Design a protein around this ligand. Structure first.
Ligand SMILES: [Mg+2]
Length: 199
């Protein structure tokens, strides 16, 4: 599955593929862009089958419903929603276009990389654990981005030797997605990514 979107401030591409032969995807995503801001999230439910999907889908629904809140607040709602569920790893990104500012919060192994034309990268390390409903050691990042910056959020089904280099080389989200095709073919898991190129 691919979805492409564009407005004055961002071009995005979402890609999602189930593990081959698997009908029920355990990953979820949400994305909404308007003229002022972007919110997106990617989640990977623990375990297998419908129960993994239940966990990541609940995150998708909460991010959509609570999009207006700070990422810190949204991720806490998501944690609380994981009580009595499988749990999920998840990352949430909000971007304010006029300010060229982003805010990012994550628990678990969903990765985020933002590359700026100047060579500046933001590539935070994963926080261990997962959203479980138990207390978390949350870490939020707020930073400015420069025009031309490109980013990816991806689940652990995407196995790529050097993702920063793909963001640097590719000049559009389509080019970057095409350069990743050879790694999507070798997946052993559900694979979801969101690419963006910021004006
Ligand atoms: Mg996975």
């Amino acid at each position: 599955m691919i979805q492409v979107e564009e407005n004055e401030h961002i071009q995005t591409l979402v890609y999602q593929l189930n593990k081959e032969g698997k009908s029920i995807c355990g990953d979820s995503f949400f994305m909404k862009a308007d003229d002022k801001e972007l919110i997106c999230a990617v989640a990977d439910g623990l375990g297998s089958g419908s129960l993994a999907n239940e966990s990541s889908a609940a995150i998708k629904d909460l991010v959509e419903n609570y999009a207006s809140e700070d990422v810190e607040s949204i991720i806490e709602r998501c944690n609380q929603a994981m009580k009595n569920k499988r749990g999920a790893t998840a990352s949430i990104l909000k971007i304010n276009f006029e300010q060229r500012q982003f805010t990012y919060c994550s628990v678990g192994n969903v990765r985020f990389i933002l590359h700026s034309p100047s060579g500046e990268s933001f590539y935070p390390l994963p926080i261990s654990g997962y959203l479980s409903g138990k207390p978390q050691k949350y870490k939020t990042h707020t930073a400015t981005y420069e025009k031309g910056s490109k980013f990816i959020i991806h689940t652990d089904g995407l196995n790529v030797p050097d993702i920063r280099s793909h963001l640097k080389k590719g000049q559009s989200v389509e080019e970057i997605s095409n350069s990743l095709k050879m790694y999507t073919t070798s997946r052993k898991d559900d694979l979801t990514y969101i690419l963006g190129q910021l004006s």
